């Protein structure tokens, strides 16, 4: 449910 | 079981479809204080000397006890604490059988207790193993084997022991 899960992957 | 069912011996034919280092198992045992194991029985109109002691634990008195005369009787091993049998269990095959006791071989912690026959959770004892069917090589059928008691006799009347294979 974290809004920015994709940003941490990059 | 429902989720498992939803997803879905090498014995003789006469026997199928049927149902039932040399370290000792307990090298260490709690030390029994001499203050216990000997009740101070008192006797006579004046209980001063009392001249007596009595064991407070189970003992294998032996088949030929023939109680000593009371005047010479210092130690006492009351019959209620005595047992003529022990629930030896054989580690092989998982079987357990009640068998007569034969002799107390090696009691640790002052083996004078072994002279007194005390077991106390670890004493080795000879047992009549003939019921188990043991047979040593050469055709000389066995009828006795060593066993070590495990359960404390004081805490229960049964005398369990593990067979020494």
């Amino acid at each position: 449910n974290f809004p920015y899960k994709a940003k941490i992957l990059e | 079981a429902h989720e498992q069912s939803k997803v879905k011996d090498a014995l003789p034919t006469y026997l199928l479809d049927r149902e039932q280092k040399f370290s000792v198992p307990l090298p260490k045992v709690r030390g029994i204080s001499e203050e216990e194991m000997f009740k101070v029985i008192k006797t006579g109109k004046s209980r001063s000397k009392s001249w007596k002691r009595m064991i407070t634990k189970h003992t294998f008195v032996g088949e030929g006890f023939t109680r000593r005369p009371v005047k010479m009787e210092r130690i006492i091993r009351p019959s209620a604490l005595r047992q003529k049998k022990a629930n030896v269990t054989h580690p092989e095959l998982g079987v357990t059988v009640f068998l007569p006791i034969l002799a107390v071989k090696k009691n640790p912690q002052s083996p004078m207790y072994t002279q007194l026959g005390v077991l106390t959770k670890g004493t080795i004892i000879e047992v009549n193993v003939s019921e188990l069917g043991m047979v040593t090589a050469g055709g000389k059928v066995v009828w006795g084997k060593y066993a070590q008691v495990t359960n404390e006799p004081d805490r229960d009347g049964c005398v369990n022991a593990v067979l020494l294979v």
């Binding site: 449910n1 974290f2 809004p3 920015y4 941490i8 | -």
Partner: protein
């Protein structure tokens, strides 16, 4: 009193044969710069074999909010090491500034989990840049257009020990 955000930097005491050791940086929230440097050393000890004796604070500066007046939602990574092993946690907060959001998060953690400040850790903080990125309903209810709610139990204070007026709850 109020929590103050701070940034910390170090380079592990440069020595021979290693010119210009790589810099590291970690945002920290603390009442004072000393506690911020302490938390920075505690984090570097976990993420690295270095120690406070082996390093130094290259810099220390407060981080004021760029727009303290602006209202902003603030999700926050969280993990607390009790009663069992540490595990990740997440919570949304509607706060005017990141520092007030961190303070409300520490209060909500100490309340609903009895976590102490030493156990709580803030792995990340970030604003919710756009609407509907919010997930939990308790923040969504405040986003309704033209929202209005009352305060029916307005219990007025009375400095006097006695009150002849028999005060009402109005409202």
């Amino acid at each position: 009193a109020h929590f103050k955000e701070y940034q910390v930097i170090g380079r592990r005491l440069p020595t021979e044969s290693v010119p210009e050791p790589k810099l590291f940086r970690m945002r920290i929230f603390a009442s004072n710069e000393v506690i911020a440097k302490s938390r920075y050393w505690y984090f570097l000890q976990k993420l690295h074999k270095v120690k406070k004796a082996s390093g130094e604070i290259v810099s220390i500066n407060q981080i004021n909010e760029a727009h303290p007046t602006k209202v902003k939602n603030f999700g926050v990574w969280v993990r607390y090491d009790s009663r069992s092993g540490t595990h990740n946690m997440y919570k949304e907060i509607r706060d005017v500034s990141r520092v007030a959001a961190v303070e409300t998060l520490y209060q909500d953690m100490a309340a609903r989990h009895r976590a102490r400040f030493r156990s709580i850790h803030i792995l990340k903080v970030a604003e919710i840049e756009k609407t509907a990125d919010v997930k939990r309903q308790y923040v969504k209810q405040f986003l309704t257009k033209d929202l209005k709610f009352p305060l029916p139990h307005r219990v007025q204070k009375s400095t006097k020990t006695f009150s002849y007026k028999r005060p009402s709850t109005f409202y």
